[PDB]
Short mmCIF file of C-alpha atoms and ligand atoms in Angstrom, two decimals:
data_model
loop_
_atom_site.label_atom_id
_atom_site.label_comp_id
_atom_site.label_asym_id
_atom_site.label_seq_id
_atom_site.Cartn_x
_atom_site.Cartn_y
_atom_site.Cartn_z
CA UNK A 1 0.00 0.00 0.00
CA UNK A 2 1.60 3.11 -1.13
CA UNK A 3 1.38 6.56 -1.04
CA UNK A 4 1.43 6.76 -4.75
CA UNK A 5 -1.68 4.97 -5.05
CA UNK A 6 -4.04 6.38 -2.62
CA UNK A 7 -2.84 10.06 -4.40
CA UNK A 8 -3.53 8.80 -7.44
CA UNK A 9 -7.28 8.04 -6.30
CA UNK A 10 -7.77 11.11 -4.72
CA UNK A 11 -6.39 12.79 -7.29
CA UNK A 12 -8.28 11.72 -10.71
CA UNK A 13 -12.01 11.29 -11.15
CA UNK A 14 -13.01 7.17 -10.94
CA UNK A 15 -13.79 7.05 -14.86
CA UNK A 16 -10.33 8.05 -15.15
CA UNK A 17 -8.88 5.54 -12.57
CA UNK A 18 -11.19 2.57 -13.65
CA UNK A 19 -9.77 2.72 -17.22
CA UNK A 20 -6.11 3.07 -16.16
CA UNK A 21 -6.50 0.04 -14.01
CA UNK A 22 -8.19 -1.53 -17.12
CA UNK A 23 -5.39 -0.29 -19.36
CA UNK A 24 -2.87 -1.29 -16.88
CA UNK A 25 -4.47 -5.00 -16.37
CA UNK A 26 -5.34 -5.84 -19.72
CA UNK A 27 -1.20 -5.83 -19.70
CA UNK A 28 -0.82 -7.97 -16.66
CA UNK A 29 0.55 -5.13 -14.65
CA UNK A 30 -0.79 -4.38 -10.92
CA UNK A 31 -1.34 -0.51 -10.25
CA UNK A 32 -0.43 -1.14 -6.69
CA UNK A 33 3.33 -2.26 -7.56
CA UNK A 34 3.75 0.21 -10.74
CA UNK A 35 2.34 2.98 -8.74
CA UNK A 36 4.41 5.95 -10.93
CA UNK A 37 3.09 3.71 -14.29
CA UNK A 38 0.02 3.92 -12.57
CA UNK A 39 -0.28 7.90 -12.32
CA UNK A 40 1.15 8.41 -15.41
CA UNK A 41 -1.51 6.76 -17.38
CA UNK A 42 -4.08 8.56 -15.24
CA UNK A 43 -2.26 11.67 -16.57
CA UNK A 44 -2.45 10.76 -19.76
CA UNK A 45 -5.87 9.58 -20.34
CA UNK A 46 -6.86 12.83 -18.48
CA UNK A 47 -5.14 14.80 -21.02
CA UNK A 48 -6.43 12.92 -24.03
CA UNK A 49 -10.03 13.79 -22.80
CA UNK A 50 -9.51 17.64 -21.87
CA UNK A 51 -7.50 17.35 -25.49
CA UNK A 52 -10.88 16.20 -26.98
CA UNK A 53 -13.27 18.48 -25.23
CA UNK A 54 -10.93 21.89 -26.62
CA UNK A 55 -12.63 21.06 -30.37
CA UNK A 56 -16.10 21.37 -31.65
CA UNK A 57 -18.85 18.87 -31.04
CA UNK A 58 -17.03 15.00 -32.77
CA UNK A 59 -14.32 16.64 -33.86
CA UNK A 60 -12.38 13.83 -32.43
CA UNK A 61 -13.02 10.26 -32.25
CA UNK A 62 -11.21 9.42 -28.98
CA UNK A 63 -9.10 5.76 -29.39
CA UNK A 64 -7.53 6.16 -26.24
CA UNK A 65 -9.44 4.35 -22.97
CA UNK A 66 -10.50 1.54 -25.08
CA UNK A 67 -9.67 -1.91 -24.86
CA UNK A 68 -7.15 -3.08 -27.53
CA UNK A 69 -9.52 -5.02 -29.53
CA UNK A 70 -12.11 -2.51 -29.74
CA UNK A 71 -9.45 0.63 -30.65
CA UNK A 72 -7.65 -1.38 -33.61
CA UNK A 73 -11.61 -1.57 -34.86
CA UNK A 74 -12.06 2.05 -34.31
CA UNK A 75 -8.71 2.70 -36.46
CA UNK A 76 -9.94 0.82 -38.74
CA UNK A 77 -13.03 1.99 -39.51
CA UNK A 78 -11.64 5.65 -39.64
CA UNK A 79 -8.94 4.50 -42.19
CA UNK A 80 -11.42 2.04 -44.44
CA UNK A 81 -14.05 5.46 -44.35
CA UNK A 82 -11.23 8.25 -45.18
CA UNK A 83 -8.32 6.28 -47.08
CA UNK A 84 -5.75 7.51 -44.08
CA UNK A 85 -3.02 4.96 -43.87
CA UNK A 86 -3.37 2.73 -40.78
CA UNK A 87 -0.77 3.54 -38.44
CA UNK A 88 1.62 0.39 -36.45
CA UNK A 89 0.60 1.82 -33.31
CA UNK A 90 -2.32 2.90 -31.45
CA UNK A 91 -2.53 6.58 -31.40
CA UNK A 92 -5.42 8.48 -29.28
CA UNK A 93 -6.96 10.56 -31.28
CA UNK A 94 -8.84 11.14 -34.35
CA UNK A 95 -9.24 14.51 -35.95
CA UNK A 96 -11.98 14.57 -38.07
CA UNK A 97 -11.53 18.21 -38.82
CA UNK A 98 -7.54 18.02 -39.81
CA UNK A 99 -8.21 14.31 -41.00
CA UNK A 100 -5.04 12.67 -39.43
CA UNK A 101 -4.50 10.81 -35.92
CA UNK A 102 -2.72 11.85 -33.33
CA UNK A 103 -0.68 10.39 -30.23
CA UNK A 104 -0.49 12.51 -27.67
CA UNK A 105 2.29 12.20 -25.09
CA UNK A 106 2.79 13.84 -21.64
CA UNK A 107 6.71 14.04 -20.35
CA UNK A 108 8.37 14.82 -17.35
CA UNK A 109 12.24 15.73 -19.38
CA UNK A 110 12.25 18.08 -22.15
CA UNK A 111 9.65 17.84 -24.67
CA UNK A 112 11.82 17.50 -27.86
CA UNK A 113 14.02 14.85 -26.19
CA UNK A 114 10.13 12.67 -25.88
CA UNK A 115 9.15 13.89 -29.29
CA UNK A 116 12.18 12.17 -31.08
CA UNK A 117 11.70 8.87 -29.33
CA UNK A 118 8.22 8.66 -29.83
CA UNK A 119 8.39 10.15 -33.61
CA UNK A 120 11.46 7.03 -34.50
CA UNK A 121 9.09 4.14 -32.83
CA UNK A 122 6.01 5.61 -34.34
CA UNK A 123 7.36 5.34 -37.60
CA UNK A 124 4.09 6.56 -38.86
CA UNK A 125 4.64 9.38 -40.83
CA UNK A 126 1.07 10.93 -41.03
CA UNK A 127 0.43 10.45 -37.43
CA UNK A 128 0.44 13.77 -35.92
CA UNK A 129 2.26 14.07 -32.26
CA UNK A 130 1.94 16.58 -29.81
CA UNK A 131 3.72 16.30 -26.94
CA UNK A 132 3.06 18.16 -23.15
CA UNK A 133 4.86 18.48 -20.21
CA UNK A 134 4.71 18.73 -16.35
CA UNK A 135 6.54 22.65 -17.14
CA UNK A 136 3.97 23.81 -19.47
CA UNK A 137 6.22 23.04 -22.66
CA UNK A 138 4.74 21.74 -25.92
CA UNK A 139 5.83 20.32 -28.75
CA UNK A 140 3.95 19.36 -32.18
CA UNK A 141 4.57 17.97 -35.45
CA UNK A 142 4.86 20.87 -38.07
CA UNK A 143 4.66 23.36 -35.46
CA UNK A 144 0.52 22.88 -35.77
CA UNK A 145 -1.19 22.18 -32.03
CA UNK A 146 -4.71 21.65 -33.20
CA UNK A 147 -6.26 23.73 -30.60
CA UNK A 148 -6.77 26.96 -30.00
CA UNK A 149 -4.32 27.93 -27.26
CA UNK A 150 -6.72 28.61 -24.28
CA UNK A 151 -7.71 24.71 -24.50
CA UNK A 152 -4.00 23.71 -24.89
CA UNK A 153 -3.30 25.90 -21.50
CA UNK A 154 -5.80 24.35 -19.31
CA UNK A 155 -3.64 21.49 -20.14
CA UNK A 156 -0.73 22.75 -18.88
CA UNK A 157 -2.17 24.37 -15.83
CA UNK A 158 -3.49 21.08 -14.86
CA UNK A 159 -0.63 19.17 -15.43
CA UNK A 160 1.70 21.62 -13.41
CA UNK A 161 -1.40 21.41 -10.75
CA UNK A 162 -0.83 17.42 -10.11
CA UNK A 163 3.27 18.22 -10.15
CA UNK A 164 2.90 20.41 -7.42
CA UNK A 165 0.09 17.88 -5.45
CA UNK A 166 2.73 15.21 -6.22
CA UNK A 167 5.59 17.68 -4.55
CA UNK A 168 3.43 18.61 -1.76
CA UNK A 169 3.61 14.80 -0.94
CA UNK A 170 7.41 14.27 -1.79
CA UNK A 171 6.27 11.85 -4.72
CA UNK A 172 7.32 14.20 -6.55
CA UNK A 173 11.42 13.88 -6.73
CA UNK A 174 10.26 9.62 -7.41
CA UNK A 175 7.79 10.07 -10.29
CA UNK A 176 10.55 12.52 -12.67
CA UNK A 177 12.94 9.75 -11.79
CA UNK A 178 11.26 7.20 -12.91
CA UNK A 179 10.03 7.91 -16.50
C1 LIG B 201 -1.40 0.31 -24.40
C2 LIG B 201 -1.29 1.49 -25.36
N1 LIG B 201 -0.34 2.47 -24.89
C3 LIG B 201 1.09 2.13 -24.21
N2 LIG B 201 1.44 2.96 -23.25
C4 LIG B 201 0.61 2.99 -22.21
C5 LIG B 201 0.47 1.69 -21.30
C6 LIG B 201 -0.79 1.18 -20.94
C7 LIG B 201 -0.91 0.05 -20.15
C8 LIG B 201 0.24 -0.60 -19.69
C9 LIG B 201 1.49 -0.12 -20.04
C10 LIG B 201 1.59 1.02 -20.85
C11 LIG B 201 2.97 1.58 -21.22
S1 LIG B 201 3.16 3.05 -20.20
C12 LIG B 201 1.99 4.43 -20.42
C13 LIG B 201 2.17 5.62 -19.70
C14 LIG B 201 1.32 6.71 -19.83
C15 LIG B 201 0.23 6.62 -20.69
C16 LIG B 201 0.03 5.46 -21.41
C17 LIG B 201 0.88 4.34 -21.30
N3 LIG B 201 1.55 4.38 -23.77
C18 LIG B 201 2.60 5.44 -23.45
C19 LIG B 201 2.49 6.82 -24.03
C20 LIG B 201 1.39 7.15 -24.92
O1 LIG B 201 1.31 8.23 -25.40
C21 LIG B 201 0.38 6.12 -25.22
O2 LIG B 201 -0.70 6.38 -26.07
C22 LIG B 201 0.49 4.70 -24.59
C23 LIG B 201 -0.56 3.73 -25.01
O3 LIG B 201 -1.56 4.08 -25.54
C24 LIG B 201 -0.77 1.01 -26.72
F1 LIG B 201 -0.60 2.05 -27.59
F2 LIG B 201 0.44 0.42 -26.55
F3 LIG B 201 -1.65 0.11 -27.25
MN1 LIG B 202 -2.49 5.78 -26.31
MN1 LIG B 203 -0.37 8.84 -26.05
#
């Protein structure tokens, strides 16, 4: 029983929490031993759905939260409707408006040092990326961030909120190190 873990479920709404446990199961790993896996993906996923609230009304499919069966089908039906290339990983989004995918990534080092890891493994070249961090950096393919910018910094305000909850609690110093 850590401290992580009863943060992380004060700290995130229960939709959130369910599907990271999901997520995190469906994998065979145990949120109460990968405790800093376990807030990260909280992170994440709440990102992903503040990212698809900052659109219009289904601008974005959201592939994210879903099991893996169920997302591939949801790629698929998006590429076999708008002759997008399927991509070799599961991104998050779908932009409906823009017409491309798009894996979002939150990071706790510099946001171009993420980017280039993420961009090389992707090796999808039409997936878009746009990357956030815990210092209220971004980073985006082609310099485009989809949003307007007051939905990209509620992002950053709430992602620089849970750093400092996380520092409050001296989880902080743990989480950076362990990404
Ligand atoms: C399962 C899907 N994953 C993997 N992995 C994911 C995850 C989920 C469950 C168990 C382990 C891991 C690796 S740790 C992590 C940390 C933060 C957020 C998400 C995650 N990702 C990391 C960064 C992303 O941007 C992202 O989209 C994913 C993601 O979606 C996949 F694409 F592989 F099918
Ligand atoms: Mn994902
Ligand atoms: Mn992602």
């Amino acid at each position: 029983g850590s401290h992580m873990e009863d943060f992380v479920r004060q700290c995130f709404n229960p939709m959130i929490v369910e599907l990271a446990e999901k997520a995190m199961k469906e994998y065979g790993e145990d949120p109460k031993i990968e405790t800093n896996k376990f807030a990260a993906i909280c992170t994440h996923l709440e990102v992903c759905f503040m990212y698809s609230d900052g659109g219009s009304k289904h601008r974005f499919e959201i592939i994210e939260g879903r099991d893996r069966i169920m997302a591939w089908t949801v790629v698929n039906s998006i590429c076999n409707t708008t002759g997008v290339e399927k991509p070799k990983f599961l991104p998050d989004l779908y932009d409906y408006k823009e017409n491309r995918f798009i894996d979002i990534g939150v990071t706790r080092r510099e946001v171009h040092i993420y980017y280039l890891e993420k961009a090389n493994k992707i090796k999808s070249e039409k997936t878009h990326i746009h990357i956030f961090s815990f210092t209220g950096e971004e980073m985006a393919t082609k310099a485009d961030y989809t949003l307007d910018e007051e939905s990209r910094a509620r992002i950053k305000t709430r992602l620089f909120t849970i750093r400092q909850e996380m520092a409050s609690r001296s989880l902080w110093d743990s989480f950076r190190q362990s990404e």
